[PDB]
């Protein structure tokens, strides 16, 4: 009689997985987006008799850090990272997070920032001259040229801080900025250290890694699974309703 | 169901992006025009179940889940680059280099 509960739980988790897939498909064009992997997880109920009821609860692993594809925009301050590079920026709460959205912008007061959040380098957030043109090197050097001044006065005015996370130990926070897991940050320190083995490319921008074939296959599988679970639900309901009349005289 | 109200946001973002592209293509002959480029952002994620214990002498994958919320058009930037110069031979036409605007 309780198989209806297992079937409805499976249906609800299928709906959750469908919602995850729809979320991945919707923002398929945001720059520097990481897809949200998902896979059903089994939980067996047991004890003292005939362990048969095994429930299903959907779960989502961290992400797939497969690099997104690069498109050339020729904008001087667009950065594309290596296989597993990250740019570290302070978040709203004041803590640091990691991202790959290379669409840097400069405010009216010489404040560099990715969308919403300022970029950090040596020390606090990096600041450039008031209206200087900015060029980004292949290793993170920010060269500034004051307008009108002759070209022979290009000066380095700071440096980006680049970290290296392999991917299995980073988890997406509530605002889309990745952070190290508990054990990873315990064993590598609260704040990561800059490394030179990471190179950027100026002028190109990174998209998102969403697989249309994977999305379509998951949608088809979820549709079929949900329909099967619904059929099991209605069969069990009809069986119980027909059998309920035994108590009569 | 959240799927409908997520795909609605996806469709809206796509429609606005198409409108921006159409606007850029419409004024392909407007003098002194700077092209538009629309950038979006994913909404804040909603967590349901926190991840459990990990690396406990086992090779299990994490168990936590968090559903998305959709995508919103966050900004639209105009590329203030340098365009080409067309010769009109009219004595009262001015083409400005570098950066600057007439008040």
């Amino acid at each position: 009689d309780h198989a209806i509960y297992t079937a409805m739980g499976a249906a609800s988790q299928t709906l959750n997985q469908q919602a995850v897939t729809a979320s991945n498909l919707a923002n398929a064009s945001t720059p520097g987006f990481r897809a949200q992997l998902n896979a059903l997880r089994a939980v067996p109920v047991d004890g003292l008799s005939l362990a048969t009821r095994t429930l299903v609860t959907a779960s989502t692993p961290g992400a797939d850090m497969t690099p997104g594809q690069l498109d050339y925009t020729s904008r001087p301050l667009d950065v594309a990272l290596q296989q597993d590079g990250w740019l570290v920026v302070q978040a709203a709460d004041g803590a640091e997070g990691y991202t790959r959205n290379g669409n840097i912008q400069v405010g009216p007061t010489g404040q560099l920032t990715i969308q919403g959040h300022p970029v950090i380098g040596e020390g606090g957030p990096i600041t450039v001259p008031e209206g200087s043109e900015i060029t980004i090197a292949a290793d993170g050097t920010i060269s500034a040229l004051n307008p009108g001044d002759p070209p022979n006065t290009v000066a380095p005015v700071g440096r980006l801080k680049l970290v290296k996370a392999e991917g299995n130990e980073v988890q997406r926070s509530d605002d889309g900025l990745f952070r190290l897991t508990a054990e990873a940050q315990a064993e590598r320190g609260a704040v990561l250290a800059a490394d030179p083995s990471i190179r950027i490319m100026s002028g190109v921008l990174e998209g998102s890694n969403v697989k249309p074939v994977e999305a379509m296959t998951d949608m088809i599988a979820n549709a079929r699974r949900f329909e099967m679970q619904m059929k099991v639900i209605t069969s069990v309901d009809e069986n119980e309703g027909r059998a309920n009349q035994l108590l009569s005289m | 169901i959240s799927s409908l109200w997520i795909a609605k946001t996806g469709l809206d973002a796509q429609q606005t992006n198409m409108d921006v592209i159409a606007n850029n293509l419409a004024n392909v002959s407007t003098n002194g025009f700077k092209r538009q480029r629309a950038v979006f952002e994913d909404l804040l994620y909603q967590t349901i179940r926190q991840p459990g214990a990990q690396s406990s002498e086992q090779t299990t994958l994490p168990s936590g889940l968090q559903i998305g919320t959709g995508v919103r058009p966050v900004a639209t930037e105009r590329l203030h680059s340098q365009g080409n110069l067309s010769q009109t031979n009219n004595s009262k036409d001015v083409a400005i280099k570098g950066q600057g605007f007439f008040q």
């Binding site: 997880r41 939980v43 067996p44 109920v45 047991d46 004890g47 003292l48 008799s49 005939l50 429930l55 609860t57 | 179940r49 459990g52 214990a53 406990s56 299990t60 168990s63």
Partner: peptide, 21 residues
């Protein structure tokens, strides 16, 4: 005891954990 029979001790609670520690 065999299923469906009588017993003098209550069954232990059911847990069904997501992932064992």
């Amino acid at each position: 005891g065999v299923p469906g029979a009588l017993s003098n001790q209550p069954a232990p609670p059911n847990e069904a954990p997501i992932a064992t520690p």
